[PDB]
Design an enzyme around this catalytic site. Structure first.
Site, PDB file in Angstrom:
ATOM      1  N   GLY A   1      29.856 -10.419 -24.612  1.00 31.05           N
ATOM      2  CA  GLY A   1      29.718  -8.965 -24.685  1.00 31.05           C
ATOM      3  C   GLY A   1      30.246  -8.368 -23.396  1.00 31.05           C
TER       4      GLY A   1
ATOM      5  N   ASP B   1      42.077 -17.531 -26.533  1.00 32.23           N
ATOM      6  CA  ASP B   1      41.319 -17.013 -27.650  1.00 32.23           C
ATOM      7  C   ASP B   1      41.024 -18.099 -28.673  1.00 32.23           C
ATOM      8  OD1 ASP B   1      41.531 -14.530 -26.360  1.00 32.23           O
ATOM      9  OD2 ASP B   1      42.720 -13.602 -27.971  1.00 32.23           O
TER      10      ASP B   1
ATOM     11  N   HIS C   1      35.969 -18.379 -21.693  1.00 33.28           N
ATOM     12  CA  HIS C   1      36.991 -17.441 -22.129  1.00 33.28           C
ATOM     13  C   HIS C   1      37.350 -16.434 -21.043  1.00 33.28           C
ATOM     14  CE1 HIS C   1      38.565 -14.020 -24.615  1.00 33.28           C
ATOM     15  NE2 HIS C   1      39.248 -15.026 -25.130  1.00 33.28           N
ATOM     16  N   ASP C   2      36.341 -15.881 -20.367  1.00 39.56           N
ATOM     17  CA  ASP C   2      36.558 -14.944 -19.256  1.00 39.56           C
ATOM     18  C   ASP C   2      37.370 -15.621 -18.164  1.00 39.56           C
ATOM     19  OD1 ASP C   2      34.882 -13.098 -20.514  1.00 39.56           O
ATOM     20  OD2 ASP C   2      33.223 -13.388 -19.067  1.00 39.56           O
TER      21      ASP C   2
END
EC number: 3.1.1.4
Lengths: 121, 121
Positions: free
Chosen positions: A29, A89, A47-48
């Site tokens: 989020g 992704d 992912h970040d």
């Protein structure tokens, strides 16, 4: 672009990223910080971090090219920078799928106090 | 639910929230700290604050009922809590629409050092 991320989550994990992974743990989020709370949360942390390693294009904005075959994503090698975004992704989508067994609403909407100083990438 | 917010943004403002508002200013796709950088950013700040006031239901997760005719959004009065979520999302989508002409990439991916001030709701 993050709409493509949503589409990959749907193709790979069989569920919507926006619906299910938009308020989970410390990192799934907006405004992610702190320490990942579980496997799903770590997927988002990774992912970040993956995005932070992309140089020369904008991973949150730029569109990439890919194909999908029965839930198998092939990131096209038309541009190494946007391919890197795609691979970020794809990896996250796969991670959500692989950890579906420990997805837990225990980690929905957790208190601010639960997410403080960040684990470094 | 944030998927519904996306639908409201798409209809009301004419562009995707996930595509264009996931990394804008201090609050669009970020939040928790800073001062709004422009009017679009303020839309996101207000939306966060609005969600903050929701008691008794989960504004990020819970689905609300609405109708839409000719681009309007009418949040149904079937449940005051989910109606409150709907109204938050509706207001934000309207705000994005009303400020679309000043939307600027100046505010894409801004450094954390630009979002250290604290503004209360």
């Amino acid at each position: 672009n993050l709409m493509q991320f949503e589409l990959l989550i749907m193709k790979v994990a069989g569920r919507s990223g926006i619906v299910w992974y938009s308020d989970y743990g410390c990192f799934c989020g907006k405004g992610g910080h702190g320490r990942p709370q579980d496997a799903t949360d770590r997927c988002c942390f990774v992912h970040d971090c993956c995005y932070g390693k992309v140089n020369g294009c904008d991973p949150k904005e730029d569109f990439y090219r890919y194909s999908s075959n029965n839930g198998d994503i092939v990131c096209e090698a038309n541009n190494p920078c946007t391919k890197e975004i795609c691979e970020c992704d794809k990896a996250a989508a796969i991670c959500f799928r692989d950890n579906k067994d420990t997805y837990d609403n225990k980690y929905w909407n957790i208190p601010m106090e639960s997410c403080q100083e960040s684990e470094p990438c």
